[PDB]
Amino acid sequence: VYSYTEKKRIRKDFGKRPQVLDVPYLLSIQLDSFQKFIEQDPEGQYGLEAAFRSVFPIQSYSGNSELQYVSYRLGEPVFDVQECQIRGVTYSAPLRVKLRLVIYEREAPEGTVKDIKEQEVYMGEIPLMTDNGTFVINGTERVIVSQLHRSPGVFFDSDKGKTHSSGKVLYNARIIPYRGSWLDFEFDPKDNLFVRIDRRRKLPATIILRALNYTTEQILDLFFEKVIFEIRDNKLQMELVPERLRGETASFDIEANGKVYVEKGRRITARHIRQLEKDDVKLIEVPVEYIAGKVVAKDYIDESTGELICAANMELSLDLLAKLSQSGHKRIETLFTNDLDHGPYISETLRVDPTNDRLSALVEIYRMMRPGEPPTREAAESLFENLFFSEDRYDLSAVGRMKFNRSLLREEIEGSGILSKDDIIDVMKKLIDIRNGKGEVDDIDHLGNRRIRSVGEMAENQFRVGLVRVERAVKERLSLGDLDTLMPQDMINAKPISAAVKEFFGSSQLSQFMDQNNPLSEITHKRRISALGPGGLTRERAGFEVRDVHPTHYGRVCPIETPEGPNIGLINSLSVYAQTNEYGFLETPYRKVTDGVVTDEIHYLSAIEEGNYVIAQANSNLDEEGHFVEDLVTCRSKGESSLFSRDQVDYMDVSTQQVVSVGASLIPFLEHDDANRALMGANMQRQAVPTLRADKPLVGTGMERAVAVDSGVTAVAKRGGVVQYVDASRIVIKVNEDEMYPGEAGIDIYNLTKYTRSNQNTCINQMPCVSLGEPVERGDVLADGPSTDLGELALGQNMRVAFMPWNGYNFEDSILVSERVVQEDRFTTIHIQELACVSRDTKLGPEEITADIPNVGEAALSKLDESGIVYIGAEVTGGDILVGKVTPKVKDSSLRVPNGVSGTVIDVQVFTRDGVEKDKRALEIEEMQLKQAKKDLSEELQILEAGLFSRIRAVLVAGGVEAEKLDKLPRDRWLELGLTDEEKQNQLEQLAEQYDELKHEFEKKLEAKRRKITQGDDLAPGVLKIVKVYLAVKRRIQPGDKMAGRHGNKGVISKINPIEDMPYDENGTPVDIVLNPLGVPSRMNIGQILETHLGMAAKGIGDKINAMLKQQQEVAKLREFIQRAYDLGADVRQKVDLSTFSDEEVMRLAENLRKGMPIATPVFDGAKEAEIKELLKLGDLPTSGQIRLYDGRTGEQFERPVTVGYMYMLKLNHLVDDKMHARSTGSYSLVTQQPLGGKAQFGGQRFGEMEVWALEAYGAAYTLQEMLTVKSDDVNGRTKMYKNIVDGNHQMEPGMPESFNVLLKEIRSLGINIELED
């Protein structure tokens, strides 16, 4: 069973793989993140309260005055979303913080405060998230793109390759905070370990280690194990353990108990270790020479002298052995050195160390941080301490600690934000371990090392910055703290917080201006992950490893949608099911698998947890139980794939689509076409343009429903009901009584958005899609947004296409289009341009908005009203006047239409600074809006009263029913009728109180709306009034506009021929569009051909339905035919009968399918070759899919039958008339007298460096001189050339380039003397 709204046109499907998890709310990312950003949640936990508790309470040092927090609230906005859109204000809400301030007395800190105060302090406003998941900033609609920034924690890298060109792989470790100074360590060819902070000057590492109050002896003992030589009367006998003997060549005989165990020169084999173990031989003898090469660990002193016998970290010898022997110290300690297991890294760094004591270390760090000043003891101490151990300038969040502990093999995941000596020590240990072989560098491209910041986190960061700024100011003013003469409204300044948050939301490399020329453009622009932005990399610093897809991108990032060119892979888009983990990592769904049963539950796995498990690929055959029918199944385990046994896999892919995104899952038959053109098409589909009639794409992928409903363009219902009143403007729904609350009953109203400017100047509009008086299901489409129909994403249009090279007009990729296409008004798009005129005040008088304008043809003034403004509907053409603005002197400075644009004014907004005179047409629009609001509120109240009194009638059906007395009097009094002692009388009294309350609310809300309208919409300072005219131009398709399919088969529309000369089949139908066959093989996308075949089949069934419906073939024939069509062969998830469909429903279905049957095709589980031929067989069309075509001109057959079907083709937002731009002679630039560039300015093209080279590559000299002297630069030259041209002479006068003289003057401005010679 399906929603009747879907029963309107139920989409045929071919997906066999039974789904297990429905596509989630596609916008979960932004919506959930901003929900996290604002809600009353105690104990912080990633919310505003977290920031407040981080920075509050606030107290001055020993000031007896602390400033504590209570709670926060976000009151209502000042407008509603549409009102903000039209006016321009930010769709923001306040921040009422209950702030509590108390002051102590002198020497009573623990004692109770002498004073207490609390108030609802106000602190600026912040934007909120529209329902669709956007933000309105300055009247535009902006969405913030989630960033994929390098995750905090510890990460190790190799830095191999061209490092010294020696082949010596380096190693380095980085500790990255979520906020704070970085920490870096690296090795070198000398194998001396180093450290550096914020990529400043290199330093040894021991020096920083010693800065933690660590003695060199302590450092060596901590880093290295002990080797103990004991003086037993001679030879310094050794306590040898076998474990430290692997891979060693003994140059001296190793023996004990008088028995030789390793002969001189024989290397220690595993058998020798076994001997020393089983025999339990530990004490051994060594010669003096063997101790020469070792190194002392600690420092020793003599009994009498008490002086340094030997410093730590220095090689020994016989003389030194005697020097330490006279003292008689039995314990001789050394550190085990082995180039293959433990090298002398820390020892070498100690040798490189400059000094000894902690003070000199701190001095060195202080100088390094801020070079060129005197180091100081206390200042350096504080600097070092708070640089890493203070929340002031350091913090690792929970996820930072999670990564840190999971990369050091710790146990606890929760710890302190600041670091500690043990942490850096363990980092050193891990770095040396990986240097010695154990442990591996962490590939950064692995997703687990990267994380998705959403809007919530960025807004939290900027709010934190604002809060710390205001806190600093608060402390500064509390330093002047006075005796309760104030309430806490002067410590808190509004400017910092609002300034920071607004600066972020308005200017931000990530908070991009929204792309709105589609449903899909939004749905895939808010699910975009930008590697750029603050905290991430930049385009320049991106090698071909970050861009490349990592094999763990499976299930978490789409590999087939990224912008092409300057940034490939930096803007990877989110997957379909992929969501964000609590810690921010990218989790993806899977199906839990028991011994042999694929449990239908769902299990989300992170980027790292996946590797531990082995996961089975989506399309593995299972039969009614989940038991794989093959013992060996293709599965991926750890960044790789291979065949694995049936009883080895504990996880299975949920749906075959979880590799791709919404921006590419819609490409039908994607599995057939190459990755390249698939990516290009996926990018293209986001560039569609909403046409004049959405047309239900024939070959869809069943995701149209989700994108259309969740994109927000379609006014999806909220509570099921009956469509009482329908209209292009509003739709009224009578909610079912069971679905409606008992009190506050009312009804539902949707005000469909009409033609308004979209952010790319395309038209966004809605149309009713439900007939008057029809049921509607809760959460169903009611109005089809642009590029949608019946709640399905229809960007372009299905069109009859034929693949054949037709007379060379399809040379490279160009597309030939029959005149029939433009005649039927198929691609005709609506563009809407916004033009603004501002009326300011300046010296010599203000700028009036009158009509009286000197020296203008009266026909110009005809199109204006008496005020001097154009009417709603006067077709304007390039050059005419919209609004009459005059600069006092008086001179005409009226706004004019941009040159070269048609139009038909659809609306004119007029905002006026508060407290200024409203002009005639401004008063008229004021009255228009006033009347509209009055009508809306009045009809709301009237229909509500009608419903309430119908409820009263239903109540009065019993308990004093009086038919004659019911209609005797009007609806003025319906409570005076007789009733017994029943609760109905009380309910009638309740309904009368409700009626009075409704009257009062309608009156007061109408008053509020009238006040809103009356107060002239305030403007930026300095401006009097602004007027915006919308011109609604209509653009057909002309030879040079771009159109293309979904598989990236681009093409600019070439000569559109008359319908007569197009190829026509035997039946006579012309084929609308004649592509180029030669684009199939080289551009490896065979998907489009299968799509065309399926399109021909779909329209074959559509033609059959239309034929059997044109003829009266009641129910039976069409019922059986449709049922046959919907089953059609192998296993399908549809399994749709038609008995449930009443004959009315069946005929509605037939009517909506007469234009074709919408066929679905899940991306990789789609329709095979066998089923397409079967569908064609159900029709009356050739099985091969090729039909002979007759040439339009000659009228004879084409040999070798050609392919014709219905392919869905878009129109892309590159219209020729937007590009075609020329010039002859116009305004030049001021600083240099050169022609302007661009299109907005009436400019000219660029004769660039490359063009100059190409010119001089020929012998062409005069042309180059003309290009760069007389046509571009020479101010006097070009005027003379113009005058000569008008006189029929083509004479050139050289002169001199003006910009050349400008450069001469500029360089003379420096200390340079340049002149010209003879």
């Binding site: 001089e1256 020929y1258 000299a1261 001189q1265 001199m1296």
Partner: protein, 46 residues
Amino acid sequence: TTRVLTEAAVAGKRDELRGLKENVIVGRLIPAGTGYAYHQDRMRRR
């Protein structure tokens, strides 16, 4: 710009204007193609 201009200033190097890039800067005929003939005239004057 820095190094070249510094060297030119210190050396006081007069510019001959013989190649093709400098002449484009000056805005006169390039001594490469047709303009070569014109140059063949002008060098003949001196």
